[PDB]
RNA sequence: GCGCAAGACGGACCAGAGCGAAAGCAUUUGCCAAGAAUGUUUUCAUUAAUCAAGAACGAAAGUCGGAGGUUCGAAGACGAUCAGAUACCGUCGUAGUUCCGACCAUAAACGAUGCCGACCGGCGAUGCGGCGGCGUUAUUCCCAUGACCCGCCGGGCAGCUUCCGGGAAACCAAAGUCUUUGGGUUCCGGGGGGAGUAUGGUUGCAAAGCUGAAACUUAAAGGAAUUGACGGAAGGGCACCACC
């Protein structure tokens, strides 16, 4: 008999300052009723917004899970949580007559943010290759995976989550993987397909202020 | 529908092949000559032979037809087949050989031929179709 | 077919075949004569050689072994024996 | 009541069109995924268990759901079409494009199109027998 | 007598090939006996390709696709008319049909 | 609402007993919407159809 | 929508591709001990082939003991279809399906095709190793290696093809080299039933496994292929003695 959407109030989810688009949308939460507080209700909210909504001229087939953790009175400040490729680019990549090279590490940032850098790569049929398939032998796909876990541990352990997501916007990791690993087997379309988030140290308020500027 | 059986088409084909000079485009003067050439049991077959003939005479202006053979085309094809050009297409002053062709001619002691102009061989060994 | 000459195969027809499937078994290997540039000695090395062949004087490598043919090191030139 | 913004800007909710053959769902939700709005299924329109997944049953499932959020001022939607997946069929139900077309003809706008259906790396045992659905 | 030369299968020189289900019947047919089919169609049917584009807040927004791989059984493929019976001499011709139009 | 239409080209005659002609239908609002519909009755090219629900799709019954 | 756990399973990449004695085997990483093929102007110098007896491994199911039980699930209970269903269909669901210690030793365990050896047509691909060669990429340019491209050699799983020859044919480059019959060697069949039954011995906790008759009973059982006919198999086509 009562509309529950009268007691709901809106908030502006504000992205961090690593991008060009700062405000990304709205959210809904009920008001506080004394026993519970609406900041706790809006605490565990993830936001799987794509990259074309955060930067203008970039690609669109990448995603970014964004947990919000600060509310500032009609201002919801969010933090980077995870990364993912869209499920159309993934199934577009996987053809038949080539190999898929998978890799993952549990790499650690300098502030303590235990990430998990998944990876994926595919071999490249040449320009004049009459031959039908292009697979790779087992020590070749073990040496590509060896050079993958090298670079996605030496590009993360030297930094914290400031510079890692600046590298993740043009995806410099894959553009270094293929450029480093042409000399083993030519990789074709190599990305980081997922970034998870294993465990986080306790939140400090002034640090997220630096991430929004 | 209106399909002409083997009797109409066989009779029309022979009467074109033997009497092409008298037949033209008018169905009526075709009927008046198809009843003076041939002995057809009468009209409803006579007008069907003369109609396929009137459809078959229009088909001869646009070229030959794969059945009958008439001697106004088969003299023009004969004068088209006895056609030699003035200077032949095999009289070329600069003919192009490969490197390896010149080696075969040197095996046949024809390395002293002057008209041969050896081309640069192809840089890539790329000739097979891309299987898959 | 049906009139070859088995007594007299052509010299390219001999070299195509397996070394045991020729008319008489000929080996496919040789003894080279490697000259290390940093030294002045002469050490006779088998072509399809196994574990490494060191010079006696300079005590450096000459050829590390491979699958079929032992590859020489850099600067090591060789002139084939007869 | 609604987002206090100018109407030239387009706000965003996300709909999760769970298309199956038992019925078709339309579950609009905010961008968080937590506080949802309204869930107008395909089965709520016609009272027939045979017609619970018809392409007309999603024509009317995405006409009423375009009135509750237009009541709250939502103008552009995010679309996550989902077949039942898992071990069952990973091909979408027939009442999916009709529920998109009824959402795109009711004045509402679209955002992203994305296919999140549950596909496993590998899963448990299928429902049927070894010899299968003998029918 | 032997109707097929490869026994209706692609097993040539191994002992056991793994069993997978059927998509419709859910019947355990071996992996090189399932009729396979790869579909690349648009996620929204082509009648609603204009009306998805007028409601686009993005400009020249691309259309995502469905990529499922279908392993039909042998019994229910011929029932579903995806594969058929051919002649005794058309049986030996394993070329794919002319889909390119 | 009700929408008035036109006929571009008749496609083929479907149905259980061949009672339905299937027709490629243009609208009259200068629209580029060439919908396909199921019409029962005698149709030639250049008719003026009248639909009640102008968003339905052509199936085969 | 955020988490937590539990056990199961390792897609797409996955091929008429790879390895394995056969059953059989796909996520990362390390460790441990094996192997084929190739290369060799190493070594021993007949040490070999096939095999009674005897022996190792043996999918699935099942039986003794513990551990765990996510899905699925014999038996069982319900609901429906049905003239009738004690079945197909749908919902629950014990033993089982998973882990380890014993047993069991069978399958459409199949290529329905014993192993070793020689000779006998082509063609294009493919996997692994070796050798030779234009010319393109990367390791900044050079060498070497990788990725290709063009061949050659060896051994593999296969394919197409053919008046090699066989075959009752279907078909087979082996199922050829066979009345022009003899390279070595193991197993094993003798019209159809009774019957893989009865009995005896042996193995096993049992379930069962191995070995294995006769009395009687029959004039056919059967293999390939042809021509119809039939189909609740498809593709097409037609008829107001069909429909709309
Ligand atoms: Zn099936």
DSSP codes, chain B: -----HHHHHHHHHHHHH-TTT--S-HHHHHHHHHHHS--S-TTTHHHHHHHHHHHHHHHHTS--SS---TTHHHHHHHHHS---SS-TT--SSEEE-HHHHHHHHHTT-TT-SSEEEPPPPSS---S----
Q: How far is the CA of D125 from the centre of ligand 1 (A)?
A: 16
Q: Where are the domains of chain E?
A: 1-101
CB of F13 lies under 7 Å from some atom of strand G:
no
D52 CB contacts (<8 Å, ≥6 apart)?
D22, D23, D42, D43, D46
Q: What is the DSSP-derived secondary structure letter of residue C38?
A: S
Q: Tell me, yes or no, whether chains F and C touch by having 3 or more C-beta pairs under 8 A.
A: no
Asked if B53 contacts B23 with a C-beta cutoff of 8 angstroms, the reply is yes
Helix (H) or strand (E) holding D69: helix D61-71
Domain boundaries, chain A: 6-213
Report d(CA A158, CA B119) in Å as an integer. 59
CA distance E68 to chain A (A): 9
Q: Give which of A154, A10, A160 is closest to D32, Cα–Cα.
A: A10
Contacts of E27 (CB under 8 A, 6+ apart): D128, D130, D131, D132, D133, E21, E73, E75, E76
Q: Could you tell me the distance in Å between the CA of residue E15 and the C1' of nucleotide G58?
A: 14
**Residues of chain E neighbouring D113 (CB-CB closer than 8 A):** 43-44, 52, 61, 63-64
Three-class secondary structure of residue D102 per DSSP: helix
Domain ranges in chain F? 1-61
**Residue B116, beta-bridge partner list:** B95
Instruction: Report CA(D22)–ligand 1 centroid distance (Å).
Output: 20
What's the CA gap between D14 and D112, in Å, rounded?
9
Which residue spans within D16-75 are E strands per DSSP?
27-29, 36-39
Residue with tokens 């139009």: E101
Obtained via which technique? cryo-EM
CA–C1' E68–G185 (A):
56
- Kindly compute the dihedral angle of the four CA atoms of residues A190, A195, A198, A203, in this order, to the nearest 10 degrees: 140
Protein-covered nucleotides on strand G (Cβ within 7 A):
1-3, 7-20, 22-30, 38-41, 70-74, 88-91, 97, 111-113, 121, 125-135, 137-139, 143-154, 156-161, 169-172, 175, 223-225, 233-235, 243-244
CA atoms within 13 A on the CB side of A28: 25
Q: Using CB atoms, which chains have 3+ pairs under 8 A with A?
A: B, D, E
Q: How far apart are CA A56 and CA A54, in angstroms?
A: 7
Between chains, do D132 and E52 touch, taking CB under 8 Å as contact? no
Confirm or deny that C39 is annotated as ligand binding: yes
Spatial neighbors of C61 by CB under 8 A, at least 6 apart, are C52, C53, C54, C73
In units of Å, what resolution does this entry have?
Answer: 3.2
- Listed in sequence order, the DSSP H helices in chain A are 38-41, 87-93, 138-154, 161-168, 172-180, 205-212
Q: Are D62 and D108 in contact (CB under 8 A)?
A: no
Residues linked to residue A48 through DSSP beta bridges, in sequence order:
A65
Would residue B63 be called left, alpha or beta, if left means φ above 0 and alpha means ψ between -120 and 50 degrees? left
Interatomic distance A131 CA / G154 C1' (Å): 22
Q: In Å, what is the CA distance from A21 to each residue of A10, A13, A17, A90, E77? A: 19, 11, 9, 26, 51
């Amino acid at each position: 008999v009562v509309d529950p959407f009268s007691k709901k109030d809106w908030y502006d989810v504000k992205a961090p300052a690593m991008f060009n688009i700062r405000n990304i949308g709205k959210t809904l939460v009920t008001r506080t009723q004394g026993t519970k507080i609406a900041s706790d209700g809006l605490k565990g909210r993830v936001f799987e917004v794509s990259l074309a909504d955060l930067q203008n001229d970039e690609v669109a087939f990448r995603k970014f899970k964004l947990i919000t953790e600060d509310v500032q009175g009609k201002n919801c400040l969010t933090n980077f949580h995870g990364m993912d490729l869209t499920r159309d680019k993934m199934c577009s990549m996987v053809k038949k007559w080539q190999t898929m090279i998978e890799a993952h590490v549990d790499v650690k940032t300098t502030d303590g943010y235990l990430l998990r850098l998944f990876c994926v790569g595919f071999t490249k049929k040449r320009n004049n290759q009459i031959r039908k398939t292009s697979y790779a032998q087992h020590q070749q796909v073990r040496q590509i995976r060896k050079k993958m876990m090298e670079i996605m541990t030496r590009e993360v352990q030297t930094n914290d989550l400031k510079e890692v997501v600046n590298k993740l916007i043009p995806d410099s990791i894959g553009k270094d993987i293929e450029k480093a690993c042409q000399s083993i087997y030519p990789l074709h379309d190599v990305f980081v397909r997922k970034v998870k988030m294993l465990k986080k140290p306790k939140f400090e308020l002034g640090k997220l202020m630096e991430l929004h500027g | 529908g209106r399909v002409r059986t083997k009797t109409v088409k066989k009779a029309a084909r022979v009467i074109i092949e033997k009497y092409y000079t008298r037949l033209g485009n008018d169905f009526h003067t075709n009927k008046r000559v198809c009843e003076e050439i041939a002995i057809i049991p009468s009209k409803k077959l006579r007008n069907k032979i003369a109609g396929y003939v009137t459809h078959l005479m229009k088909r001869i202006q646009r070229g030959p037809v794969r059945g009958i053979s008439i001697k106004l085309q088969e003299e023009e094809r004969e004068r088209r087949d006895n056609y030699v050009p003035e200077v032949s297409a095999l009289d070329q002053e600069i003919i192009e050989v490969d490197p390896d062709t010149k080696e075969m001619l040197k095996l046949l002691d024809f390395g002293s031929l002057s008209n041969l102009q050896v081309t640069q061989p192809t840089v890539g060994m790329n000739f097979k179709t891309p299987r898959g | 077919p049906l009139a070859k000459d088995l007594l007299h195969p052509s010299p390219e027809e001999e070299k195509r075949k397996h070394k045991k499937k020729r008319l008489v078994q000929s080996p496919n290997s040789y003894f080279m004569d490697v000259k290390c540039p940093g030294c002045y000695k002469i050490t006779t090395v088998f072509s399809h050689a196994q574990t490494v062949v060191l010079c006696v004087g300079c005590s450096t490598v000459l050829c590390q072994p491979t699958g079929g043919k032992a590859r020489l090191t850099e600067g090591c030139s060789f002139r084939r024996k007869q | 009541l609604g987002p206090q913004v100018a109407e030239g800007e387009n706000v965003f909710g996300v709909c999760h069109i769970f298309a199956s053959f038992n019925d078709t769902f339309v579950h609009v939700t905010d961008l968080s995924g937590k506080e949802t709005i309204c869930r107008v299924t395909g089965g709520m329109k016609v009272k027939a268990d045979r017609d619970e997944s018809s392409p007309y049953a999603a024509m009317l499932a995405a006409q009423d759901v375009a009135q509750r959020c237009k009541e709250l001022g939502i103008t552009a939607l995010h679309i996550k079409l989902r077949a039942t997946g898992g071990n069952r069929t990973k091909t979408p139900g027939p009442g999916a494009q009709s529920a998109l077309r009824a959402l795109a003809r009711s004045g509402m706008k679209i955002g992203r199109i994305e296919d999140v259906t549950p596909i496993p790396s590998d899963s448990t045992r299928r429902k049927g027998g070894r010899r299968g659905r003998r029918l | 007598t032997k109707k097929r030369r490869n026994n209706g299968r692609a097993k040539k020189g191994r002992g056991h090939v793994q069993p997978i289900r059927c998509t419709n019947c859910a019947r355990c047919v071996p992996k090189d006996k399932a009729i396979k089919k790869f579909v690349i169609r648009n996620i929204v049917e082509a009648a609603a390709v204009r009306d998805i584009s007028e409601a686009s807040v993005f400009d020249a927004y691309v259309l995502p696709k469905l990529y499922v791989k279908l392993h039909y059984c042998v019994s229910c493929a011929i029932h579903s008319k995806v594969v058929r019976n051919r002649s005794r001499e058309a049986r030996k011709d394993r070329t794919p049909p002319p889909r390119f139009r | 609402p009700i929408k008035l239409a036109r006929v571009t080209k008749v496609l083929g005659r479907t149905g259980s007993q061949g009672q339905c002609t299937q027709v490629r239908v243009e609208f009259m609002d200068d629209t580029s919407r060439s919908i396909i519909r199921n019409v029962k009755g005698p149709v030639r090219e250049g008719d003026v159809l009248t639909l009640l629900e102008s968003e339905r799709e052509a199936r085969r019954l």
